[PDB]
Design a protein around this ligand. Structure first.
Ligand SMILES: [Mg+2]
Ligand SMILES: [Zn+2]
Length: 608
């Protein structure tokens, strides 16, 4: 029985596409809420756009049914529909009273702990423009945003919608962006992004989930640190190291989870609180999504639907909230594992022990938090003992059902942290020529090159494509330098792309903190700065003076993670790449290029 906080939106939409507005009676939506549609052109890209640079400089990976399949997506109104006709439904049942009580206490203690030192604040339009002028949003039309911010007409709209919220109403926030001319629709998706940043941006801008403030979080830490954090955690005495995943986390978030997240509001006052409340209850709990769909008579239409008690939006606020909730979830599971609560307390908390839960949170919460590494729905926990493996009563009752395992089958962990996966990566200890040890991230090489082969917008803008390829290359040199193929392929890209071109585009995926590779500065210089100078786990600060001195994985670890070394296809590519490099050059044109290759061929380890 809901459709009120949304009425405002559907209206502002109906009176713009009114010349097109209409009801379909063919809407396939029975899970979402159909509100009508309007005629629109079909923007749905045929399928996938390849990065011509990364692609030409990786011929062997042409025929790898693991990097290929990862590229072709369906942006067409047809694909947008097929996808939308598969999404999960298994409406996470609200937790029982006993579970709801423990979660309430836990989340009460957590919010208090996070707010112990820092004070919430509103983020300015200046911070916005600055986070906009760098940081990322999802493509290279990100310059359209850098421009929209300089336009007084975009902020005029923001002023109108901001005033609208201070009274508890939403008009132009729809987290979907599709469609003298007008760019209003764009000024709105972005506007909603600002209003949200202004109201709840402090969580991330002030690092409320950084390890220091959250104890278990890792916000702001790049891959150069995550490895060392895993080691530190995977060393506190106790049971094995557990790293369970929730099956479809986003769909397992309950109204109870949403209520607990919404407790931030109690931390705020006056205008800030009112602005934040409009975000939480208008733009988060009530979603307004747009979707293209092929209608009758070959005409395409934009369907305007909505959902109740939805996840949220603005993947930066989302990340903070997901981290918060997961931290709470793990604390509860630990409580059970330690025998503070059990199967008898699930339905109704027992034998007068609510004070025991508050005592445990009070005296153990902080230490317990330091035994976790939580990044959104991803986590690593080292409990006091292995009773954690069977501590599944509250976990399952919270709808946080583990992925790839029977509901009541105890979890399995490890002893050696050197193999625990975290943030789509397995962190390894690497011994350099000079005896020193690094802790580096590894992950399947097929996914690494597969992602680099992907590019936004039907690449007509070479500069962007080459610049994106360069960020991937330099990202690899910084994080995946130990992988033989990536080091070689990276240097090829850097040799084929003009030296003066600044790397642009998105490389940071899944993870977020990072971006050090987005420079025109020498990569050995930045490698030195992040792996030695600024590495608080690096005792000896003596710099490395050559790439040959920067270690590789063991020939065995390189393959463990998908190396093509030892293969003929890769033998033929490593030896005659200068041709492809030249080909790229000729195509991109007459520019200044530097050769990072030859210096590499000097330390080429081949055929075993
Ligand atoms: Mg995990
Ligand atoms: Zn709004």
């Amino acid at each position: 029985s809901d459709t009120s906080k949304i009425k405002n939106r559907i209206e502002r939409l109906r009176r713009e596409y009114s010349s097109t507005w209409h009801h379909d009676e063919n809407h396939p939506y029975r899970t979402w809420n159909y509100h009508g549609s309007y005629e629109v052109k079909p923007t749905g890209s045929a399928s996938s756009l390849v990065n011509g640079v990364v692609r030409l400089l990786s011929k062997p990976w042409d025929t790898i049914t693991n990097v290929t399949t990862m590229a072709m997506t369906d942006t067409t109104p047809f694909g947008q529909q097929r996808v939308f006709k598969e999404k999960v439904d298994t409406k996470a049942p609200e937790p029982p009273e006993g579970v709801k009580y423990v979660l309430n206490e836990t989340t009460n203690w957590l919010w208090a702990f996070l707010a112990r030192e820092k004070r919430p604040r509103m983020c300015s339009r200046e911070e916005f423009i600055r986070k906009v002028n760098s940081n990322a949003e999802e493509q290279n039309q990100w310059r359209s945003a850098r421009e929209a911010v300089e336009d007084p007409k975009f902020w005029e709209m923001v002023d109108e919608e901001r005033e609208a919220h201070l009274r508890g109403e939403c008009h132009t926030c729809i987290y979907n962006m599709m469609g003298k001319g007008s760019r209003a629709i764009w000024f709105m998706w972005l506007g909603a992004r600002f209003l949200e940043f202004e109201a709840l941006g402090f969580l991330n801008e002030d690092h409320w989930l950084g390890r220091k403030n959250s104890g278990g979080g890792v916000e702001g830490l790049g891959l150069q640190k995550l490895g060392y954090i895993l080691r530190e955690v995977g060393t506190r005495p106790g049971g094995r190291i557990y790293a369970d995943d929730t099956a479809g986390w986003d769909t397992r978030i309950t109204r109870a989870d949403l209520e607990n997240e919404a407790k931030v509001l109690e931390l705020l006052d006056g205008e800030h609180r009112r602005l934040a409340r409009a975000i939480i209850e208008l733009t988060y709990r009530h979603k307004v999504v747009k979707v293209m769909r092929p209608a009758a008579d070959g005409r395409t239409v934009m369907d305007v639907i909505s959902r109740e008690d939805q996840r949220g939006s603005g993947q930066v606020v989302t990340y903070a909230l997901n981290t918060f909730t997961n931290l709470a979830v793990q604390l509860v599971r630990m409580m059970e594992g330690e025998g503070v609560i059990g199967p008898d307390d699930v339905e109704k908390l027992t034998k007068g022990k609510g004070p025991k839960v508050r005592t445990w949170l009070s005296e153990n919460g902080e230490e317990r938090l330091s035994r976790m590494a939580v990044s959104g729905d991803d986590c690593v926990v080292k409990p006091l003992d292995d009773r954690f493996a069977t501590s599944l009563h509250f976990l399952n009752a919270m709808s946080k059902v583990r992925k790839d395992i029977q509901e009541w089958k105890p979890s399995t962990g490890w002893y050696d942290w050197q193999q625990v996966p975290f943030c789509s990566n397995h962190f390894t200890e690497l011994i350099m020529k000079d005896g020193r040890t690094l802790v580096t991230p590894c992950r399947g090489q097929d996914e690494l090159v597969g992602r680099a082969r992907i590019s936004p917008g039907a690449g007509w803008n070479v500069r962007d494509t080459a610049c994106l390829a360069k960020s991937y290359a330099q990202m690899w040199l910084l994080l995946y330098f130990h992988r033989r193929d990536l080091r070689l392929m990276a240097n090829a890209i850097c040799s084929a792309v003009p030296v003066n071109w600044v790397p642009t585009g998105r490389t940071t995926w899944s993870i977020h903190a990072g971006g050090e590779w987005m420079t025109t500065e020498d990569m050995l210089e930045v490698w030195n700065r992040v792996w030695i100078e600024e590495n608080e786990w690096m005792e000896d600060k003596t710099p490395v003076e050559k790439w040959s001195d920067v270690p590789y994985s063991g020939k065995r670890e390189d393959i463990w993670c998908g190396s093509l070394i030892g293969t003929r296809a890769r033998a033929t590519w490593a030896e005659n790449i200068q041709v492809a490099i030249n080909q790229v050059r000729s195509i991109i044109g007459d520019e200044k290029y530097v050769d990072y290759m030859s210096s590499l061929k000097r330390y080429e380890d081949t055929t075993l």
